Design a protein around this ligand. Structure first.
Ligand code: HEM
Length: 153
């Protein structure tokens, strides 16, 4: 369970992401795909992309970036009271998309990497610790829901 102080560090760096969610989502997905190429296979619409240039030019990858960060943003803003937001998400990612928790760990890593690079103003060690806490919470609660749904994760 995060403190209010920890939530405010999360939400301060989020506020910067929101200046340009599409740009941040491009960087974050590209980092994910570069770091764990196996994750790209889950995206039938753009899993053929071969290079970072291709990725940066893909309108479909850009939309996905906006989707993930907007959904995550809405979750973070709930400050742990995210049961409603996680229901649909766990169901789709468990049952349709088939995303293991380890891939949720991979995108969490990419999120932290990009924020650390982009936002040294709002992503010092304390803020990064708070964001890691929030993302662990997210992954813990998703994992519990996956189990409920019958998915090993
Ligand atoms: C912070 C983590 C994540 C959040 C908040 C998130 C949220 C979403 C949302 C809102 C959608 C669209 C609605 C839906 O289908 O449920 C979506 C679709 C999808 N997500 Fe995620 N997601 C996350 C992580 C992942 C990861 C790590 C992968 C794969 C490695 C993944 C694969 C997909 C796929 C394949 C789709 C369908 C996209 C499409 O067909 O257009 N997601 N995700």
């Amino acid at each position: 369970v995060l403190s209010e102080g920890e939530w405010q560090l999360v939400l301060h760096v989020w506020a910067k992401v929101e200046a340009d969610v599409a740009g941040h989502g491009q960087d974050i997905l590209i980092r994910l795909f570069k770091s764990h190429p196996e994750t790209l296979e889950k995206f039938d619409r753009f899993k053929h992309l071969k290079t970072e240039a291709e990725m940066k030019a893909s309108e479909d990858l850009k939309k996905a970036g906006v989707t993930v960060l907007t959904a995550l943003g809405a979750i973070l803003k709930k400050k742990g009271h995210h049961e409603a937001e996680l229901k649909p998400l766990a169901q789709s990612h468990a049952t349709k998309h088939k995303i293991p928790i380890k891939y949720l760990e991979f995108i969490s890593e990419a999120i932290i990497h990009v924020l650390h690079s982009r936002h040294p103003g709002n992503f010092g060690a304390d803020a990064q610790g708070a964001m890691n806490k929030a993302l662990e919470l997210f992954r813990k609660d998703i994992a519990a829901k996956y189990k409920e749904l019958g998915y090993q994760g």
